[model samples]
Target: HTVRAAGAVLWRDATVEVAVIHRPRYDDWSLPKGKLDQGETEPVAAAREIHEETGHTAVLGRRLGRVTYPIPQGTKRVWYWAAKSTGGDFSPNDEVDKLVWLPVDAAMDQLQYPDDRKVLRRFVKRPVDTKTVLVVRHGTAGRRSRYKGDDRKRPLDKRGRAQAEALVAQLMAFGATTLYAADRVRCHQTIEPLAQELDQLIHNEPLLTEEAYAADHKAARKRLLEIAGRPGNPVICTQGKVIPGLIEWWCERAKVRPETTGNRKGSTWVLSLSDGELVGADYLSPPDE
Candidate 1:
């Protein structure tokens, strides 16, 4: 069986510096990483491993890339991400006793494994100071035809409610601060769990509704851009109709190619921007699935 693992290039000062740790077991300097706990996602594992090894809180950004190498058990597959060190203090531990923040070039030289350097090179290829905007598709609302009242008032089904609760951890991993939802009950409910967890307010996006988007996609697109240009990492829950066009537009503008495009319920598009202009785009499937 392939050993699955995850880690991050923990960085600060707009990627000017990155974290490197010395493992006593191997007596080698490398990026903070470890095997994933059972049932843990790569992003969550990356954050947790970094915290455990370096005592640093991270707000994950774009995926750096993946690396695979031979291990005694089998081939080891490891994923890496560009994680910003929000704050934390490190103390000597059993696994890692020393932690140092080094410049990109210096880090590359310090890392013992060539694979680690490869990941660092990928991280340097993009603007590390980019801001993140999370664009989410609302969770499943039962069929529109089945509902008798206004479709706008439709609520998420039971599975969708569970998906919303599951979203709390995934969204929080990226440091989601502000919340916005389309002018619909289901849209609001998709992110309600997150808002309640953070004790934050959910702002209404009238232009993001399907009907509003159909009438004026350009206006909706512009509104989304305005939100992306803001300071905090905002999570905006919109409808299936609005997501594809809005996300594709942003990706095309930034020249970021997506591996696969999708708009499944509760899924998200993590958009990275540099100086208010889109620079990278990453997709995340629904939490439950």
Candidate 2:
């Protein structure tokens, strides 16, 4: 069996320094991280681990990379992201006894593992601050033939409800601030878990649905661009038809081939933006599935 885990190359004060913690359990300095909780997405697990270790609510940035190694009983894989402090202050935790924010170079020198420095280098190569936009395809509503009600009112099936429950950590991982969903019930249901966890309302937008966008592609595109322009990281659950086209459009405008087109139900697209444009993207399938 494989052991899954997640963490962040956390930095603060505009990415000037990185946070390395001294884990009492391990008695060594390392980045904040831990094993994934049940049903937690990598992004979600990483952020929760950071907070539990450092007492900082982190705003996740780009995917730095993944590190894999073997343990006594199984192979272990840990995913890492570049994250920044959003709020909260560090207090000693049972596992983490000390927190030190050091310059990248110094932190690399101080970290106990060679693998840790390798991950730090990935962040250093392109350390500019970033804004992330989450594009989510609505979860499984099953086929339209199965639903007799207005198609727009078709709700998530049992599998989709599990997917919705799985999204809570995905949003927390990236520290998403605003939530939006297509007007259809499936889209709304896709984000319902996060909205309820955040105690916020989903901003229902007709322009994001497949049918609505097919009728008014121009306006739909405009609305999408607007969300991309929003200051803080925003979460949006939309339609499959719209997501594929948007992926193609972003690739063309950003002057890069498609990096990922993972539009699976309950999957999420994290678009990493720097310098007011798309720099990269990471696709995440629901962890439990």
Candidate 3:
């Protein structure tokens, strides 16, 4: 048997203070972590588990990486991220009795396990307090051949709608406050559930659609970066064609390329920015049955 889990290197004070929790049952201090709920993604579970254990809401940052170990049942793999505390305070719980905030060095020294120290070190490695941008490809809208409507107006099929709803917790985990999408029904609909949950309107971009983008790739690229540079965390939902192009463009500009180019419906890319430049990147798969 295998158990998967998620958590964060919860930091504050400009990435100096690390959050450590005391679990009375385990009788040890560790970075707050818990098993994923049936369908939670690592990012979503990381944010939720952190808040549940420490009572602090986390605005997620870059991917710090993960650690795996042998547990009584079998093997356990815990994914971790760099997350900043946005609010809340700790209260005793059966799982976590107290939360200890300490400076990086002390946190590294005080953490119960060496793997946690490695996780803490990963957070410090980048040396930049990164801003994040989420790029998502719209979910499955039935076959184009079947829908005799404008391709742009083709809405998501039943499965796609469920995938869109599944996106709510994951997108919100990235602190997505502003929504942008291609001026296509499926793109807008893909993020509609999240927008309603966040109580925001979808800001559509006509130039982002393939037909319009073919006319002005330069403008599309420009607009993509413009959104990335915006004040708060922003998410863009576009088609497969445009998303891979944008990822390629970012690779050329940032000079760091991950092997995968997200081109599937519901696939998501978390782009990390530092000093107004794209730096690190990672991806999350859509919900599974």
Candidate 4:
């Protein structure tokens, strides 16, 4: 029997999404894999196969078990390894029909063989050693009574304005490149100062509004989790009420108890989400305080 090697490229955010290759000729979705080259070992062969198929550089992680299946002439044994994709994007020219990041269950379901499914199940159950998530609640909103006629259209009040400024100063360390805000006047007001300070536009979404929050807490949490798990750029600013859910979700997913408390006016808490654990809570005082 000929021995072969393969790689399963994995990346994480809200959920783990892996890079899978689809072969048009075989009409099968398989991990990037091939027979060992002249001097290559199993791990090296697996890494090489992944790069060849996906056009992405990858670092091999721990062994993820193997599969034995029949080929035309004889039985072929293929060893698979878990790999972290370092760089590059999906390349269709490499005979890959689509590149996607499927959650653990979805990835297992999509595998071509039952043995592959079992291997994925074992890997999914193992603890992920490290991950990072940054949570930042939005700043204070304008005083409601201040805008008598059009409450929803009001901009930041004096204190709210100051709070936004303070929030931006405190958030300087997270280096959040992406800005998202509820479409409501207050939410926008809360994020505006930081957006200006950072020279970035605030992305307004109706789903983050008070009305949306009232209707579905779970969906809001899911949306926030997805935002928190985004790759690279880290900081996220959302409303105070939404912060509790983010804390709870992080606690639940990371299997840790996150210390929760109220934030003073113009203040916020920074919680670290790495290793599926909370790194405790640190409060940022109001600028005036």
Best by TM-score: 3
lDDT of 1 at 155: 89
* Candidate ranking (lDDT, best to worst): 1, 3, 2, 4
Q: How far is candidate 4 from the true structure (C-alpha RMSD, Å)?
A: 16.9
Q: Estimate each model's TM-score.
A: 0.90, 0.86, 0.90, 0.46
lDDT by residue (tens digit), candidate 4, 49-101:
77778777765443455678888868777766566677787768646777667
lDDT of 3: 0.85
The most accurate candidate by lDDT is 1
TM-score, predicted candidate 1 vs. hidden true structure:
0.90
Candidate 2, residue 245: how far the Cα is off, in Å? 2.2
- 141, model 2: CA deviation in Å? 0.9
| Residue-wise C-alpha lDDT for candidate 1, range 1-289, written one tens digit per residue | 8987889999999438999999989899999999978656667888999999999998998877788989889898888889988899999988999999899998988999999999999899988777789999999888877654349888899999988988888889888999999999998999999999999999999999988899999999889988887789999999888888888887777788875468899898888888887777778778776
Give Cα distance to truth, residue 53, candidate 3, Å.
1.6
lDDT of 2 by residue, 185-231 (tens): 99999898998999998898988788777889888888988988888
What overall lDDT goes with each candidate model?
Answer: 0.88, 0.83, 0.85, 0.60
Task: Output the worst ten-in-a-row residue range by lDDT, candidate 1.
Answer: 141-150
Regions more than 4 Å wrong, model 1 = 1-4, 69-76, 146-150
Residue pairs clashing, model 1: none
